[PDB]
Each structure stands twice: as C-alpha cells, then as structure tokens.
mmCIF file of C-alpha atoms and ligand atoms in Angstrom:
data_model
loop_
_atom_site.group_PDB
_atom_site.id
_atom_site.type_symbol
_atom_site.label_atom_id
_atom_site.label_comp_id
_atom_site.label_asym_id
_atom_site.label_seq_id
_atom_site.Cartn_x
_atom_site.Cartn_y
_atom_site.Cartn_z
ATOM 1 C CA UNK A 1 0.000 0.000 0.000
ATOM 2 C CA UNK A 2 3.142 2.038 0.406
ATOM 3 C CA UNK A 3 5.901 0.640 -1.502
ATOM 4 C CA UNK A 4 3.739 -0.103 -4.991
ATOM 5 C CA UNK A 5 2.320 2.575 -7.755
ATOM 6 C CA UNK A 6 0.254 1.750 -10.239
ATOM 7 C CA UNK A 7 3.084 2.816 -13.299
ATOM 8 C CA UNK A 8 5.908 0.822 -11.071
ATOM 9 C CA UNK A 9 7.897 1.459 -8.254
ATOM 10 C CA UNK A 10 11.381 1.524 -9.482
ATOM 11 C CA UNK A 11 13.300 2.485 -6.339
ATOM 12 C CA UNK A 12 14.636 -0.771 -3.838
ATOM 13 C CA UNK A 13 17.667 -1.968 -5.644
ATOM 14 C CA UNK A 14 19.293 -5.483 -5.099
ATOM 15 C CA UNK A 15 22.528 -7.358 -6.188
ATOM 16 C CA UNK A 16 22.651 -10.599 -7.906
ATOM 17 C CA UNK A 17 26.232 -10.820 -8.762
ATOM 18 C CA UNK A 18 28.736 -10.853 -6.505
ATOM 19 C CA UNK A 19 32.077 -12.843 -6.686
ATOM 20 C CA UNK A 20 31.711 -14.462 -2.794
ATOM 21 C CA UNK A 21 29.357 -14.936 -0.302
ATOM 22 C CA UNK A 22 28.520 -11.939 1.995
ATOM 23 C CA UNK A 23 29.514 -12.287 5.841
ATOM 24 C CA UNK A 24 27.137 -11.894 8.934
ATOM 25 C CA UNK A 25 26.527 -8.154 8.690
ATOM 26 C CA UNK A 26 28.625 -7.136 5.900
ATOM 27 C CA UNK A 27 27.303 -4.143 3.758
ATOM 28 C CA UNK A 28 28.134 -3.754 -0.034
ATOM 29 C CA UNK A 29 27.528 -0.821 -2.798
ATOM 30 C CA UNK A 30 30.677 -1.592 -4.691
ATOM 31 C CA UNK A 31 28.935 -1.338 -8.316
ATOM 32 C CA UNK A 32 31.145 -2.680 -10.413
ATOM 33 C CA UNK A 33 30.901 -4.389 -13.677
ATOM 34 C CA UNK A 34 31.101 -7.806 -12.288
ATOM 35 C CA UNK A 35 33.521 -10.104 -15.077
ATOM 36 C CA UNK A 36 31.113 -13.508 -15.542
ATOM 37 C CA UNK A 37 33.826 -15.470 -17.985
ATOM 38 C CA UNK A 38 37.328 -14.731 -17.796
ATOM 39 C CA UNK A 39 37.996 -11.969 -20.840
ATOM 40 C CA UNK A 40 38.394 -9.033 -19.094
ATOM 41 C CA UNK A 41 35.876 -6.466 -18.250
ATOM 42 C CA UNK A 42 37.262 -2.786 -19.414
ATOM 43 C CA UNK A 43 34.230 -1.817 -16.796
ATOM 44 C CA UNK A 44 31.912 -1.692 -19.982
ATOM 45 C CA UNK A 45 28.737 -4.001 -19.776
ATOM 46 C CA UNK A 46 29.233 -6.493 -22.585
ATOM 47 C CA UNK A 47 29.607 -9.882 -23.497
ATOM 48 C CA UNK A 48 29.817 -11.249 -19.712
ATOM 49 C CA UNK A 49 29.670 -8.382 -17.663
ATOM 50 C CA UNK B 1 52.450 13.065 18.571
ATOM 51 C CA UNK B 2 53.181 12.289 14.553
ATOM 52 C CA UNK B 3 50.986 9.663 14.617
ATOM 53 C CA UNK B 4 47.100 10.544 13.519
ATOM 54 C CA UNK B 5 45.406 7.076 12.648
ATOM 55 C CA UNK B 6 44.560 5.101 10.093
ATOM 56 C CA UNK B 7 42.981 3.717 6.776
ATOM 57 C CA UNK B 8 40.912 1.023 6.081
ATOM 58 C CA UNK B 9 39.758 -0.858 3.441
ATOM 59 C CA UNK B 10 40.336 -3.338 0.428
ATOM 60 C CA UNK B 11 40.875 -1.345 -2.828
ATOM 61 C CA UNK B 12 41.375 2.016 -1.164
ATOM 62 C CA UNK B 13 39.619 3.595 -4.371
ATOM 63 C CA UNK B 14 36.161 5.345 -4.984
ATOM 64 C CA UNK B 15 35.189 1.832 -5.951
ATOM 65 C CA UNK B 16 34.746 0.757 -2.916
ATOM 66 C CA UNK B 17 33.929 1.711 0.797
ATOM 67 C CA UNK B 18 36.784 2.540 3.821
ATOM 68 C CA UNK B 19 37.415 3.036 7.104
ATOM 69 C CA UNK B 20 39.378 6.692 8.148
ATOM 70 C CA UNK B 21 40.470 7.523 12.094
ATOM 71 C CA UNK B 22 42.114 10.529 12.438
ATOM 72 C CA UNK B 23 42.988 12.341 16.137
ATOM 73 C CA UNK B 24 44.042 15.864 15.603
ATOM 74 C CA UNK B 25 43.537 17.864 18.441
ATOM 75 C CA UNK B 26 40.130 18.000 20.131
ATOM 76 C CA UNK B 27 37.674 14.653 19.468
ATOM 77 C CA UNK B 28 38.962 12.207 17.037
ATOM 78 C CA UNK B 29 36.665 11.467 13.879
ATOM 79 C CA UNK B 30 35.686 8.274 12.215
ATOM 80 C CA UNK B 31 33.859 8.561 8.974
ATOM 81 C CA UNK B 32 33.112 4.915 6.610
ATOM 82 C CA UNK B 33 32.616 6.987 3.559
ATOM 83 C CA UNK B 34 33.971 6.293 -0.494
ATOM 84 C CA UNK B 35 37.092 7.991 0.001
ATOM 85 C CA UNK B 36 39.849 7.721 -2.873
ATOM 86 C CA UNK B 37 43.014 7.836 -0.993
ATOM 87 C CA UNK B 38 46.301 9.840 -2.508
ATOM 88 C CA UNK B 39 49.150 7.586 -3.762
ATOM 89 C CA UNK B 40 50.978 9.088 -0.314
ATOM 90 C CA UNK B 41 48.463 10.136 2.601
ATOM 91 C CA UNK B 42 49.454 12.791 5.564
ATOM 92 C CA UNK B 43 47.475 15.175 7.535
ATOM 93 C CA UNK B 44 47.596 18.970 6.849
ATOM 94 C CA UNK B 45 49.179 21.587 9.432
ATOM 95 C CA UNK B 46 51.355 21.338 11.792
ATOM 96 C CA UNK B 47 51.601 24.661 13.364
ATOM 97 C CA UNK B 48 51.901 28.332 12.838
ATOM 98 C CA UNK B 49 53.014 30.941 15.474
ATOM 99 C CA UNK C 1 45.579 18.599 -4.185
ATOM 100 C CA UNK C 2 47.919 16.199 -2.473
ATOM 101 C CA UNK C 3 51.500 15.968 -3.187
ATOM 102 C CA UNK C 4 54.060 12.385 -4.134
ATOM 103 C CA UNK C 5 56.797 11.954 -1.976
ATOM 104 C CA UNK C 6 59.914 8.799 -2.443
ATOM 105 C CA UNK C 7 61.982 7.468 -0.058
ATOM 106 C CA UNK C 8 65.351 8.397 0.386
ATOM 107 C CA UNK C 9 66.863 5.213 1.716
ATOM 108 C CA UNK C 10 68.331 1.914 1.538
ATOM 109 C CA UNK C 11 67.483 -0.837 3.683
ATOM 110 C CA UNK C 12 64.410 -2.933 4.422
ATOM 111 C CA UNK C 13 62.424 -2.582 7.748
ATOM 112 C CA UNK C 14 64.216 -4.134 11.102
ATOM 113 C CA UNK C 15 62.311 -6.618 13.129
ATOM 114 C CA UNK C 16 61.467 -6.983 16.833
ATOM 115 C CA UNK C 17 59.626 -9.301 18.915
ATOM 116 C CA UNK C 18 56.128 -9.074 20.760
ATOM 117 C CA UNK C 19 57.413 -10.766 24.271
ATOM 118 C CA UNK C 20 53.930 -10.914 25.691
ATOM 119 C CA UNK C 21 52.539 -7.640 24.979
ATOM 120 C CA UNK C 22 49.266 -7.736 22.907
ATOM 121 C CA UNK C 23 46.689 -8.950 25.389
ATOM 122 C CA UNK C 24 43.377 -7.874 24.822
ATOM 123 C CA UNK C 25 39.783 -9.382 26.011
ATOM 124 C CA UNK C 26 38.176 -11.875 23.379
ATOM 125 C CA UNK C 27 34.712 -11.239 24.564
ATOM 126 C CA UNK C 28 32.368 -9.039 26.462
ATOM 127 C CA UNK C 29 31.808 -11.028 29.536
ATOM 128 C CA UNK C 30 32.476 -9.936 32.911
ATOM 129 C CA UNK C 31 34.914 -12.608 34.250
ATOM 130 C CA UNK C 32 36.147 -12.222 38.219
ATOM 131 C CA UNK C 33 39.006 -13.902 40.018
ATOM 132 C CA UNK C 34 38.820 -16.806 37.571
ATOM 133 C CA UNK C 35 41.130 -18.618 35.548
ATOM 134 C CA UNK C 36 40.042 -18.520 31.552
ATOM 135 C CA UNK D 1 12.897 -14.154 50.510
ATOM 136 C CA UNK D 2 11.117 -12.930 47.327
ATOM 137 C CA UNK D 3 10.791 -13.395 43.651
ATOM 138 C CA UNK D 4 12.976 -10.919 42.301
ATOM 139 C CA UNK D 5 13.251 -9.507 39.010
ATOM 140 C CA UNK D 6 16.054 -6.444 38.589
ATOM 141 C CA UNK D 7 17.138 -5.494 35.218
ATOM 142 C CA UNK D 8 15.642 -8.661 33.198
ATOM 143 C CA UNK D 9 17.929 -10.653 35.657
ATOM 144 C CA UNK D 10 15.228 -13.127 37.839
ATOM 145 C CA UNK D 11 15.715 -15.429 40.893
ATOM 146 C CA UNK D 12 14.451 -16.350 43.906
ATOM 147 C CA UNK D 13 16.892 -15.564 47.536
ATOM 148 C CA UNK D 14 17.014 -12.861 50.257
ATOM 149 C CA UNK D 15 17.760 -9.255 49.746
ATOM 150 C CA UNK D 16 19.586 -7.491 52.066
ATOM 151 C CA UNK D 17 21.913 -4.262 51.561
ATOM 152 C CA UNK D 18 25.827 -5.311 50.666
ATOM 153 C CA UNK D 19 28.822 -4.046 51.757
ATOM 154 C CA UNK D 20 30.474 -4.783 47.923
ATOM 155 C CA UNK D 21 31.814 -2.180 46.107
ATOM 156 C CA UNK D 22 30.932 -2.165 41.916
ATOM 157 C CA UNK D 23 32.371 -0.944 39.464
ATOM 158 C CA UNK D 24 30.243 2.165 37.975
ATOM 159 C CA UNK D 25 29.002 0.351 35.204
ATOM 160 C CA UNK D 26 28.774 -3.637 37.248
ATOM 161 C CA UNK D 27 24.776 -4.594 37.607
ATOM 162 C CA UNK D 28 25.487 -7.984 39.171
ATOM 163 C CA UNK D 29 28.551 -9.775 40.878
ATOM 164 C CA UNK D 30 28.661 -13.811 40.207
ATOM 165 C CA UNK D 31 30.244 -16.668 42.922
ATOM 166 C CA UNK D 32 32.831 -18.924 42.370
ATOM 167 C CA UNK D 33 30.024 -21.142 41.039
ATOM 168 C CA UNK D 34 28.228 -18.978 37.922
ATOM 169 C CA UNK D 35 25.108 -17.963 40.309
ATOM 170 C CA UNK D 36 24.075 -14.190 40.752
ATOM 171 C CA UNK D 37 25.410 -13.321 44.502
ATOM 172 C CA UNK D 38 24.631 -9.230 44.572
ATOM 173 C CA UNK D 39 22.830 -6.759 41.953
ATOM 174 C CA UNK D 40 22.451 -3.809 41.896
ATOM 175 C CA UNK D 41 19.163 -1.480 42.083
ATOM 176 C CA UNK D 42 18.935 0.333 39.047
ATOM 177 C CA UNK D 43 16.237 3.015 41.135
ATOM 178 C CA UNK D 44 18.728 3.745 44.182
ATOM 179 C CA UNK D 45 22.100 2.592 42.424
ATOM 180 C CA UNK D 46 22.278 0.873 46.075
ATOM 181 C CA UNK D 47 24.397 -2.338 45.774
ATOM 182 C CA UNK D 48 22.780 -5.223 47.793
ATOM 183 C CA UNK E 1 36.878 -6.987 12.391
ATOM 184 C CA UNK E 2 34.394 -9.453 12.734
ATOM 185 C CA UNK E 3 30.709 -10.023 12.200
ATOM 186 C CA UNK E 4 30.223 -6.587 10.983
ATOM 187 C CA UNK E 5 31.641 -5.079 14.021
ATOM 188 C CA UNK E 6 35.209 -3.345 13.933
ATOM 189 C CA UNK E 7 36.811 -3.616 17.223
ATOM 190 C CA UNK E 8 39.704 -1.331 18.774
ATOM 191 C CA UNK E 9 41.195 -2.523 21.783
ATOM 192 C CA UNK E 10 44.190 0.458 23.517
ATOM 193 C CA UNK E 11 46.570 0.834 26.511
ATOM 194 C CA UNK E 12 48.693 3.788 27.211
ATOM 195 C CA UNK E 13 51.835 3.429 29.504
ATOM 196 C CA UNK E 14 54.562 5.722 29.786
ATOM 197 C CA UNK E 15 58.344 4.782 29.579
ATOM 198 C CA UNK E 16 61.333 5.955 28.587
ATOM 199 C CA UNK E 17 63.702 4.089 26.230
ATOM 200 C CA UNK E 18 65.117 5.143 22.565
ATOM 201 C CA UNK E 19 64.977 2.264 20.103
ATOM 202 C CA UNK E 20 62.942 -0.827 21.822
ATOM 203 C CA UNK E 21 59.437 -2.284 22.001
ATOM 204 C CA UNK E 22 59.726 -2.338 25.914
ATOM 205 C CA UNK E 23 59.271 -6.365 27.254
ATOM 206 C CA UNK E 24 56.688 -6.814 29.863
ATOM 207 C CA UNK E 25 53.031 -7.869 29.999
ATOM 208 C CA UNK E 26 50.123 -5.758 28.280
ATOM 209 C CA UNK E 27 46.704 -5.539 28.656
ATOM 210 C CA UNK E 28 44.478 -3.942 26.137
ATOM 211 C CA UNK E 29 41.087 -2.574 26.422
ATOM 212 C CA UNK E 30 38.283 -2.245 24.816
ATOM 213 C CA UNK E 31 37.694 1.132 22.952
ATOM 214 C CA UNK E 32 34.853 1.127 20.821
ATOM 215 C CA UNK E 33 33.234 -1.820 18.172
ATOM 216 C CA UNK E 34 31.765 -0.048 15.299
ATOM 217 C CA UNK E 35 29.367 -0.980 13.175
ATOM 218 C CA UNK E 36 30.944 -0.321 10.039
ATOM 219 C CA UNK E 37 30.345 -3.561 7.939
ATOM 220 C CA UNK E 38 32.966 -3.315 5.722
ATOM 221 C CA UNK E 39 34.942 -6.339 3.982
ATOM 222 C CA UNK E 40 38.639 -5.027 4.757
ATOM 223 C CA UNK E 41 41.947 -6.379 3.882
ATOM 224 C CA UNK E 42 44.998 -3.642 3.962
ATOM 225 C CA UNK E 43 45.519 -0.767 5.628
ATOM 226 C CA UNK E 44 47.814 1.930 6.413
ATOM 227 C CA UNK E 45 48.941 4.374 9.025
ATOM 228 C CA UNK E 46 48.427 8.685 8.912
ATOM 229 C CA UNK E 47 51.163 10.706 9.997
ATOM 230 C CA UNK E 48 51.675 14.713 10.934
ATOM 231 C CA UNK E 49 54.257 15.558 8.383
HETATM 232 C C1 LIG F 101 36.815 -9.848 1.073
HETATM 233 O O1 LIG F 101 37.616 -9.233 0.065
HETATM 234 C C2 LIG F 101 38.717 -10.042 -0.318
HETATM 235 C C3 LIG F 101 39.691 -9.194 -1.129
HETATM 236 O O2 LIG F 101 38.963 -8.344 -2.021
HETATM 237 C C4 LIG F 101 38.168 -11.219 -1.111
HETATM 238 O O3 LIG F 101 39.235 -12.117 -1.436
HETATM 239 C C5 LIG F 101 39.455 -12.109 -2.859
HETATM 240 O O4 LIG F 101 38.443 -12.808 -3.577
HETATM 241 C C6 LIG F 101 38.594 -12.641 -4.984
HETATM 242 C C7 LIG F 101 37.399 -13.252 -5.704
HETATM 243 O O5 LIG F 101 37.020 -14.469 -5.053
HETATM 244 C C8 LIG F 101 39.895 -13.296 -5.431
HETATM 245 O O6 LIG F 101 40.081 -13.074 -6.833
HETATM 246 C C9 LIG F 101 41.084 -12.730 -4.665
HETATM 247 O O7 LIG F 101 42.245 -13.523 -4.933
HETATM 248 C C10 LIG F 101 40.817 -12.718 -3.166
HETATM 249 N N1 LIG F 101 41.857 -11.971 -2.486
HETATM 250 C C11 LIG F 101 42.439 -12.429 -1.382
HETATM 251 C C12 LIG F 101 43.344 -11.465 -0.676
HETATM 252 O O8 LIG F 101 42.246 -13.561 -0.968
HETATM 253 C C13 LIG F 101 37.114 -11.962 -0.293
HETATM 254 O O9 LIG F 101 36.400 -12.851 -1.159
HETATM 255 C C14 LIG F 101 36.120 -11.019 0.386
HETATM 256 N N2 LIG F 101 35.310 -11.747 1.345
HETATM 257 C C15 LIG F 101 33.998 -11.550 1.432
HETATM 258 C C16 LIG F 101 33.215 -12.660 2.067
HETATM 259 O O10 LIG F 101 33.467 -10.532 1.023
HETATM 260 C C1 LIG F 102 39.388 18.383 14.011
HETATM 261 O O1 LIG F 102 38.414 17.750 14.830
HETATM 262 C C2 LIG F 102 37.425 18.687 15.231
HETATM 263 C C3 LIG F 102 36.578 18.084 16.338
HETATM 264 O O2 LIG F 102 35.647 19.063 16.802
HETATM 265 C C4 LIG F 102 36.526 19.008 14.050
HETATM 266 O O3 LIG F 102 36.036 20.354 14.173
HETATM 267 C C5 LIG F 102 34.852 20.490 13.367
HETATM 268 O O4 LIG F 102 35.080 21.297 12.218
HETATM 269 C C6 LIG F 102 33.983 21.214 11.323
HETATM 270 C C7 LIG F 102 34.360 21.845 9.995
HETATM 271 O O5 LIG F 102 35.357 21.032 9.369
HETATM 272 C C8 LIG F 102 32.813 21.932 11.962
HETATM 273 O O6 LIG F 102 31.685 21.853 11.087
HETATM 274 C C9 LIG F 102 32.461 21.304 13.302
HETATM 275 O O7 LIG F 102 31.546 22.191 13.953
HETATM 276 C C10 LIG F 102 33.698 21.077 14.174
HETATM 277 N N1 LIG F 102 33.420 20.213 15.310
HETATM 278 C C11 LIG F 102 32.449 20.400 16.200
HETATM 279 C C12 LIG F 102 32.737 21.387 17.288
HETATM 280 O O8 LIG F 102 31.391 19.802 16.144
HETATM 281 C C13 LIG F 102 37.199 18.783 12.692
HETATM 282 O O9 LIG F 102 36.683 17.568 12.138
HETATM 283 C C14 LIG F 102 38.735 18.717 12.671
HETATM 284 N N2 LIG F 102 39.300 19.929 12.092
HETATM 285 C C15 LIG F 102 38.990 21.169 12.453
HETATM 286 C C16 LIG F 102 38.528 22.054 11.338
HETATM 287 O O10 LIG F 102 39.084 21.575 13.597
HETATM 288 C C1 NAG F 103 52.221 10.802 -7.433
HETATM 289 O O1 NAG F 103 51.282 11.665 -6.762
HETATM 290 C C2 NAG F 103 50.452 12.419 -7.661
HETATM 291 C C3 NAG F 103 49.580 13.312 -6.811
HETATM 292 O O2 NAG F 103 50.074 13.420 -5.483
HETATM 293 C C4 NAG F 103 49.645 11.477 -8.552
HETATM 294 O O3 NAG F 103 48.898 12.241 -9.493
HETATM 295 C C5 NAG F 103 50.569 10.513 -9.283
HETATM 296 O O4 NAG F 103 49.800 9.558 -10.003
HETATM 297 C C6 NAG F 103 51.466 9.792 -8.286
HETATM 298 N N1 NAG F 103 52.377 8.889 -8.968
HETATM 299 C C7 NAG F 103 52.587 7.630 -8.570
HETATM 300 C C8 NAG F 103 53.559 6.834 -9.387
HETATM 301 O O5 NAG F 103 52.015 7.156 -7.593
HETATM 302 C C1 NAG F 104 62.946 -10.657 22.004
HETATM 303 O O1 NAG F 104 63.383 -9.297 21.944
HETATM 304 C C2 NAG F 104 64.159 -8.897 23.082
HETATM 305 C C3 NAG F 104 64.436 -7.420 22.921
HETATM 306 O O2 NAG F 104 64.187 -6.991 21.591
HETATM 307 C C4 NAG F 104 65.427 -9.738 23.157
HETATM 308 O O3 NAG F 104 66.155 -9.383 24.327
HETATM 309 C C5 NAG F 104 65.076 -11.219 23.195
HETATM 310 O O4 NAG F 104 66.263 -11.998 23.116
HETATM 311 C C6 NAG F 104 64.157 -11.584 22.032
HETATM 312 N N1 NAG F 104 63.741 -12.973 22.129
HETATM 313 C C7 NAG F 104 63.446 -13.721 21.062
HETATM 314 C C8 NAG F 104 63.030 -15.133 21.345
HETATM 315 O O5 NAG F 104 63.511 -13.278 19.921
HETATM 316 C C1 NAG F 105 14.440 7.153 39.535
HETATM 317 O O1 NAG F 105 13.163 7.249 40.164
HETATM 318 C C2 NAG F 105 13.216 7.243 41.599
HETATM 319 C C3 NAG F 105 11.785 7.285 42.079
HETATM 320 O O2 NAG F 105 10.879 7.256 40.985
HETATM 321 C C4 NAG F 105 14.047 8.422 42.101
HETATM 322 O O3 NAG F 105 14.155 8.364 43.518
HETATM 323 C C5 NAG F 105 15.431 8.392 41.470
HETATM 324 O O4 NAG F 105 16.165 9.551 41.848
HETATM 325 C C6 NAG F 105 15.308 8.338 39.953
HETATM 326 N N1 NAG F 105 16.619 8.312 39.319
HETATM 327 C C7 NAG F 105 17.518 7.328 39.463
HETATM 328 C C8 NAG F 105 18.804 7.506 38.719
HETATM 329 O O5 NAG F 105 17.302 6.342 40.159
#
C-alpha cells in the first residue's frame, strides 16, 4: 500500500552478482561491472559483464 | 604526537567503501565513507606561530 | 591537491619481537578472580 | 525471601543491603560457582 | 573486524627508552566496536608531516 504505484515502483535496488558470499553483517555498494567469464571487463557491460 | 590514525579498506579507491580515524587535536573522527586515498596520505598543518 | 613523496633510503624494515605484549579481552563477559 | 526480578535478571533468595563495592558500570557480581550473589538497584544505584 | 563489528582494543603506559618495544606484559582494552560492515583487507597508518 506504500511501496507499490500503479506505473511501477522503481526504487529498492538489489545485487545478484557478486564474486563471494557476503559475511554476517557485511554491507556492499561496490557497483562494479562484475567479469562472468574470464575476458576481461574494461568496466563496460558487454559480453559477460 | 606524529601519529594521527589510520585507513581502512580493500581497494582504497572510490570503488569501494573505507574506514578513516584521524585524532588531531580535540575529538577524534571516524567517517566509513567512499574515500579515494592519494598515492601518499598525511594530515595537513602542523603549526603556525 | 595532495603531493608524491619517495623514499630516500636503503634498507628494508628491522624486526622486533612481541614478548607478551598484545593482550586484549576476546569477549564481552564480565569474568572475576577466575582462571580462563 | 522474594521473587525478584532487577534489570531482566530473575531469581528467587534474600535481599539485604551489601557491603560490595561495583564498578560504575557492574549490575550484578557472580560466585565462584556462575550464580548471581549481589545486583544492583537500578532506582537507588544501592548495591545489595 | 568481525561479524560486521570493527573492534579497537588500547593501553597507554609511559616509559622511557630510545629504540625498543619495551618487554613486559600488556593488557588492552576495549575502545569502541563499530558498526561499520565493511569487507577489509589492507591498511595503512596517517602521519603529521
Ligand atoms: C573480502 O575481500 C577479499 C579481497 O577483495 C576477497 O578475497 C578475494 O576474492 C577474490 C574473488 O574471489 C579473489 O580473486 C582474490 O584472490 C581474493 N583476495 C584475497 C586477498 O584472498 C574476499 O572474497 C572477500 N570476502 C567476502 C566474504 O566478502
Ligand atoms: C578536528 O576535529 C574537530 C573536532 O571538533 C573538528 O572540528 C569540526 O570542524 C567542522 C568543519 O570542518 C565543523 O563543522 C564542526 O563544527 C567542528 N566540530 C564540532 C565542534 O562539532 C574537525 O573535524 C577537525 N578539524 C577542524 C577544522 O578543527
Ligand atoms: C604521485 O602523486 C600524484 C599526486 O600526489 C599522482 O597524481 C601521481 O599519479 C602519483 N604517482 C605515482 C607513481 O604514484
Ligand atoms: C625478544 O626481543 C628482546 C628485545 O628486543 C630480546 O632481548 C630477546 O632476546 C628476544 N627474544 C626472542 C626469542 O627473539
Ligand atoms: C528514579 O526514580 C526514583 C523514584 O521514581 C528516584 O528516587 C530516582 O532519583 C530516579 N533516578 C535514578 C537515577 O534512580
């Protein structure tokens, strides 16, 4: 009733990749680009980043 | 009294988040904020008469 | 705004030995006259 | 010899005012055995 | 720094000597834990210069 609108409510980011597990109360906002293969990133999304 | 504190951190970069402590004079302050560190840190004045 | 400063000498860092110093408490609990 | 319950901390013994002196931030003292042997009230500061 | 928490234990004694780290016994104590949550892996020292 709060956190919805009816065009979307874009705000309340999340991260899905992250190289390691997070530890007990650990905080991250690192936004990088996140390499998924092994050719390296150049910190441009791409290919696998 | 040359000694201030300390850094932080993993990448010491914008990139990622650190840990400052510096005592100068009167209260010491500890901020966690995305600092990007000089090649060759120091505090600021010493002195002047 | 910061400035790059190199060394001027020659030799690696010394070393020294902690002898016992170091000591701190490894948890919160109030322990007295006891043997941990 | 009452039900007592200080700070959270509950039992059952006998008050009685104590000659122990606590550090300024000690609530409780424990025995050689881990049971609560003095506490302190947190409405008169008075160690008992 | 663990769980989340970073943890500063201190003592302060005074002695005189020129080039040693004194022998004897030492006792830190706790100065603060901070919740920082922060993964952290080098650091490095400020000085008055
Ligand atoms: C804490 O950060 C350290 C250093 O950034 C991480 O260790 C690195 O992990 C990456 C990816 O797995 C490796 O490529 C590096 O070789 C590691 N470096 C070291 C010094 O081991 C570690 O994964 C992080 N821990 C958590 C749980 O966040
Ligand atoms: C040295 O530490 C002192 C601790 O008080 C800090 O002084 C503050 O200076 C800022 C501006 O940089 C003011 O906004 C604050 O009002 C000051 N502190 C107080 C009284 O709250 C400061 O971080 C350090 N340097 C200076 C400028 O003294
Ligand atoms: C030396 O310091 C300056 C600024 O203080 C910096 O721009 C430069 O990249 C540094 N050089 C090296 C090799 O660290
Ligand atoms: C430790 O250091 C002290 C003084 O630096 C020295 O006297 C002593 O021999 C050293 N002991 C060891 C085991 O290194
Ligand atoms: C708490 O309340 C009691 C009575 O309500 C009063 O006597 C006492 O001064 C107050 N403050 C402290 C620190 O106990």
């Amino acid at each position: 009733h709060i956190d919805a609108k009816e065009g979307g409510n874009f705000n309340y980011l999340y991260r899905l990749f992250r190289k390691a597990n997070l530890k007990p109360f650990e905080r991250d906002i690192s936004t990088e680009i996140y390499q998924a293969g092994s050719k390296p990133c150049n910190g441009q999304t791409g290919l696998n980043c | 009294n040359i000694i201030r504190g300390w850094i932080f951190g993993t990448t010491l970069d914008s990139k990622t988040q650190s840990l400052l402590i510096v005592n100068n004079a009167t209260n010491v302050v500890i901020k966690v904020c995305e600092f990007q560190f000089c090649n060759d840190p120091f505090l600021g004045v010493y002195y002047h008469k | 705004q910061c400035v790059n400063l190199t060394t001027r000498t020659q030799l690696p860092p010394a070393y020294t030995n902690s002898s016992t110093r170091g000591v701190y408490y490894p948890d919160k609990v109030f322990r007295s006259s006891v043997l941990h | 010899c009452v039900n007592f319950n200080f700070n959270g901390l509950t039992g059952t013994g006998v008050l009685t005012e104590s000659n122990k002196k606590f550090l300024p931030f000690q609530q409780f003292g424990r025995d050689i055995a881990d049971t609560t042997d003095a506490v302190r009230d947190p409405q008169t500061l008075e160690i008992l | 720094n663990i769980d989340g928490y970073f943890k500063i234990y201190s003592k302060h004694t005074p002695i005189n000597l020129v080039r040693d780290l004194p022998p004897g016994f030492s006792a830190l104590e706790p100065l603060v834990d901070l919740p920082i949550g922060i993964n952290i892996t080098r650091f490095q020292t400020l000085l008055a210069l």
